[PDB]
Amino acid sequence: DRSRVFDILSNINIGWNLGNTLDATGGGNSVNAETSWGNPKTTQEIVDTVNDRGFNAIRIPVTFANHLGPAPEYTISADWLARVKEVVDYAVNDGMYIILDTHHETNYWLKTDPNNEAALCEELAAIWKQLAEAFKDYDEKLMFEGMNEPRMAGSAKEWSGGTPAERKLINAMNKAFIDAVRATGGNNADRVLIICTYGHNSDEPTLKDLEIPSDPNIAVALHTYTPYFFTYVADGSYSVWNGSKKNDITWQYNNIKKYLIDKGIPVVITETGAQFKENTEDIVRWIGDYVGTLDQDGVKCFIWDNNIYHGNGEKFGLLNRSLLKWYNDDIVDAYVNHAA
Ligand SMILES: OC[C@H]1O[C@@H](O[C@H]2[C@@H](OC[C@H]3O[C@@H](O)[C@H](O)[C@@H](O)[C@@H]3O[C@@H]3O[C@H](CO)[C@@H](O)[C@H](O)[C@H]3O)OC[C@@H](O)[C@@H]2O)[C@H](O)[C@@H](O)[C@H]1O
Ligand SMILES: [Mg+2]
């Protein structure tokens, strides 16, 4: 019986990621990492604006690596932990559902070499023991997502679910994460914990190898920017959405159904979105097809928002954080009103 997790998630309309913020990796061991990729310092007002538009759930990606002390304690710098807590608390103040992750650890220590399992598990657990202790008294609306796209960057199968040995390592790491958090007790005894596949990949072989914990208070996170050629800019990419590629969404979702949803395992899409390609009407249609597909089984998603829209880079921006106005209200309306 995993129905507690389903009940919690059912309270979410749609979610929103505070992207390129606490996950940013500049600035070294400093709170200034937050602004190192060009975003303004997060404020209560920024978070309020997200909530008010209809995104009542927020994912707060955080990269800890450069804020950690030496092994084996990996102590999180006090100033950084305090800042992370301030940002989470903006959301708590507004009664929001929240996901706290670890993020670009994958640029640093989180490289999925199966021969390094012990060091990997131990580092993950050490960070999560500290996070869990810090957030022990926070209510069930705060959820933890152990890893983000864990993988071996630059490997042949980096973006296709890795190798079988890597997927075994992911299973061990998911367990380490759950164990570390549960061992801290308090509200962490039954907090929703959100594990993942290798790379947050949803291909059939990747899902077939995912071990499902016996802990009843878990969910499985995937990232599904599907189809890639619509949502990203690449050789072969396009900006038109007429429905003809809805099958890409359907086929992938039927695997998520086969291995997770139809087995009663909670699933959360912790990142998706489409880069802005002067194609508002197409993105609106894609959201209909994509979010509409998730809604069939009440699966929730969180939209990636990096505050990039007018300038160069990956144009996932939705909230103009400096102005507290939305870059594209038609796109935003399609997300927040998905269930009407
Ligand atoms: O530039 C070459 C460089 O890529 C490095 O990774 C980046 C790269 O995209 C990988 C994508 O490749 C397509 O051919 C894949 O089909 C697609 O599924 C995958 O894109 C990644 O997709 C993820 C979601 O499933 C998403 O969160 C992620 O952002 C997306 O990358 O270009 C996009 C960047 O985001 C990647 O970091 C790779 O490490 C490097 O060695 C080299 O191949
Ligand atoms: Mg309790």
What are the distances in angstroms from CA 191 to CA 85, 126, 217, 249? 17, 18, 7, 30
Question: Which ligand does the CA of 201 lie closest to?
Answer: 1
What spacing in Å lies between the alpha carbon of 297 and ligand 2's midpoint?
A: 28
CB of residue 223 inside a 6 A radius of ligand 1: yes
Rounded Cα gap, residues 18 and 238, in angstroms:
26
For residue 207, which of 138, 260, 282 has the smallest C-alpha distance?
Answer: 260
Give SS3 for 312.
coil
Q: Crossing angle for the helix pair 44-53 and 78-92, nearest 10 degrees?
A: 40
Angstrom CA distances, 212 to 143, 150, 331, stand at: 18, 17, 35
* Number of neighbouring beta carbons within 10 Å of residue 43: 14
Q: Where are the domains of the chain?
A: 1-340
Resolution (angstroms) equals 1.6
Separation CA 242–CA 144 (nearest Å): 37
Q: Where would I find the H helices in the chain?
A: 3-9, 44-53, 78-92, 117-134, 164-182, 204-208, 228-231, 246-259, 280-295, 329-336
CB under 8 Å to 167, separation ≥6 — which residues?
161, 197, 198, 206, 209, 210
Beta 267-272 vs 97-101: how paired, if at all? unpaired
Neighbours of 329 (CB within 10 A): 12
Domain at 1-340, CATH homologous superfamily: Glycosidases (3.20.20.80)
What are 148's two structure tokens?
């983000």
Q: Which residue bears the tokens 């706290």?
A: 100
Residue closest to 207 by CA, chosen among 135, 125, 281, 262:
262
Name the H helices within 12-159. 44-53, 78-92, 117-134
Q: Kindly give the number of the ligand 1 atom that is closest to the alpha carbon of 160.
A: 18
SS3 166: helix
Q: Is 158 in the pocket of ligand 1 (CB under 6 A)?
A: yes
Q: Tell me which residue has its CA closest to atom 31 in ligand 1.
A: 159
Q: Which residue owns the Cα nearest ligand 1 atom 41?
A: 154
56 three-state secondary structure: strand
Reduced to 3 states, what is the DSSP secondary structure of residue 305? strand
